[PDB]
Nucleic acid binder design. Structure first.
Length: 548
DNA sequence: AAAAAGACTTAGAAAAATTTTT
DNA sequence: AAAAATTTTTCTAAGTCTTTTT
């Protein structure tokens, strides 16, 4: 059981009518280091204050990671650690390199190993304590039901792990108290703050979806506590997301033949945005918001391209005209491509590239803000991200219908599905030998069992009784079980091998549901509980003849 | 119109949990 | 009977997009 797609449209603007919960689970108080776990600075044994010893542990735990080998990290870490230090220590500890965490490191490594092998009997209780935490704070009451909360556990204090070349990595993540926690609820039983505390602010805003919010010290940005992907306040928007990408599917031809004329505009921004959009569409390039310089890791999207991320080569690789992309994309993923394009864009690109130093914005007089405004102008609620959802649902849908072999069995049909998924990861780009010794092992185990039926075949030929035919048939199914078993490992092998370098985000699930249904493939084999619990609506309201 | 704050979605990377190899 | 290997779950950083306001 669960709503809700069989439900009556909540209007825009209203998120909920009733909202009540039990607040966020804070990080358990810091347990001070045991006596025989010491920290020496310069070989000199030291016992740090609890606030300083806390931070020390953070580094002690990552004393086996690449992060702690990098300057930016170590530079930011110490400075912040210096702040959590009493005048006593402050004066003494002047540099990080002189500190010795190796003992504290070994300790938590022991702790981890110790918790790796505890009495199974007790393990159940940590799964129990966990479960009770789930039962008590993991759920909430929105409107008329008990929807699950996603990240009900507050963010523990640690060391900010900046992906890529982040000038902030290593900085101290403060322990968030209730005095920082903002609460959202409706007529609801306000959750009491931990004995002796007070919330930052208890507000009732039904124009947003979050339950708890606080500002993080590292970037100031606000962190939210939201509901499970299975919830309606999330599903409603997910079902709507793909529908918007389906709305686009219609007028895509109009929009395509539209921005193709916008290349001839008597205005820069228009002539510019048209080229930008051409990329977002053709290469599933992300919008590309303007980042803070020196406050974040420097990456770029489509709008935020600089002239140094591209190069134009009239003739290259023999065709024609080529645009060489080279830049770091999202989670510092380096995007590098030479893309043969139309002449109009080539000529248009060079125009945006006269009298400018590499450090200048390629698409100036242009930003995501404008580009998206122009988008919700043509089609309702249309944005840049939508284009990727369309491009690679459509592509998946087409891939299976041309990969899936109608007459094959389940495991072989399952691989057809996975194979399509790999092909989908081509436009967006990407996201043994112990096996063969069990494959080849059972490969003979099959022929040496097909041999039983071989000799049992000659039995019935001249002994045409009946109980003999029962033995012949009992080896037939025995060979089939090995025929089955084999194909499962033969599939796994080529599958695992195929994979070298969207499933959770850009793919309309309904596409899969319709495929799974028409080819009689149980959804359990394609989706785990995480997946079908969230894709509940699509698993339900999708006939075998659904097309994007 | 423009920018900064605020809200919401995407996703990589780790941690737990599960099956499977030694 | 750990250990090694996959495959789910949790986590939270990194984007997009919207709302709010200078």
């Amino acid at each position: 059981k669960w709503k809700w797609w069989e439900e009556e449209r909540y209007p825009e603007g209203i998120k909920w009518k009733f909202l009540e919960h039990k607040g966020p689970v804070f990080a358990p108080p810091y347990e001070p280091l045991p006596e025989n776990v010491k920290f020496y600075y310069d070989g000199k044994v030291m016992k740090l204050s609890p606030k300083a010893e806390e931070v020390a542990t953070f580094f002690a735990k990552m004393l086996d990671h690449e992060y702690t080998t990098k300057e930016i990290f170590r530079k930011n870490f110490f400075k912040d650690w210096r702040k959590e230090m009493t005048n006593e220590e402050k004066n003494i500890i002047t540099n990080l390199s002189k500190c010795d965490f190796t003992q504290m490191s070994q300790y938590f490594k022991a702790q981890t190993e110790a918790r790796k092998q505890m009495s199974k009997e007790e393990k159940l209780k940590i799964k129990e304590e966990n479960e009770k935490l789930l039962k008590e704070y993991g759920f909430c009451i929105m409107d008329n039901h008990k929807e699950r909360i996603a990240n009900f556990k507050i963010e523990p204090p640690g060391l900010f792990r900046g992906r890529g070349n982040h000038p902030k990595m290593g900085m101290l993540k403060r322990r968030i108290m209730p005095e920082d926690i903002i609460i959202n609820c409706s007529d609801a039983k306000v959750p009491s703050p931990p004995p002796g505390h007070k919330w930052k602010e208890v507000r009732h805003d039904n124009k947003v979806t979050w339950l708890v919010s606080w500002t993080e010290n590292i970037q100031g940005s606000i962190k939210y506590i939201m509901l499970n992907p299975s919830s309606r306040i999330k599903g409603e928007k997910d079902w709507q997301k793909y529908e918007t990408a389906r709305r686009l599917k219609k007028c895509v031809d109009k929009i395509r033949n539209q921005y193709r004329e916008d290349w001839k505009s008597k205005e820069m921004k228009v002539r510019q945005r048209a080229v930008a959009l051409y990329f977002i569409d053709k290469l599933a390039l992300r919008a590309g918001n303007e980042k803070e310089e020196g406050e974040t890791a420097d990456t770029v999207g489509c709008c935020s391209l600089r002239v140094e991320h591209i190069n134009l080569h009239p003739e290259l690789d023999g065709q024609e005209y080529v645009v060489e992309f080279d830049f770091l994309g999202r989670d510092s993923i380096r995007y590098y491509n030479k893309v043969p394009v139309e002449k109009r864009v080539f000529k248009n690109l060079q125009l945006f590239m006269e009298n400018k130093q590499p450090e200048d914005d390629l698409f100036d007089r242009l930003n995501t803000g404008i580009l998206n405004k122009h988008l919700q102008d043509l089609m309702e609620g249309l944005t840049a991200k939508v284009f990727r959802t369309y491009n690679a649902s459509i592509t998946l849908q087409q891939q299976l219908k041309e990969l899936t072999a109608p007459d094959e069995n389940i495991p072989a049909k399952i691989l057809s599905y996975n194979r399509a998924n790999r092909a989908v990861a081509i436009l967006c780009n990407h996201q043994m030998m112990n096996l063969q010794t069990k494959i080849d092992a059972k490969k003979e185990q099959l022929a040496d069992a097909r041999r039983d039926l071989k000799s049992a075949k000659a039995d019935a030929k001249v002994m045409k009784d009946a109980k003999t035919k029962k033995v012949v048939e009992s080896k037939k199914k025995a060979v089939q079980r090995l025929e089955e078993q084999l194909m499962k490992l033969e599939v796994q092998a080529t599958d695992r091998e195929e994979n070298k370098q969207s499933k959770l985000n850009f793919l309309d699930p309904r596409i899969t549901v319709a495929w799974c249904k028409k080819w009689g493939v149980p959804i359990e084999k394609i989706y785990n509980k995480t997946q079908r619990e969230k894709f509940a609506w699509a698993i339900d309201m999708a006939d075998e003849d659904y097309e994007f």
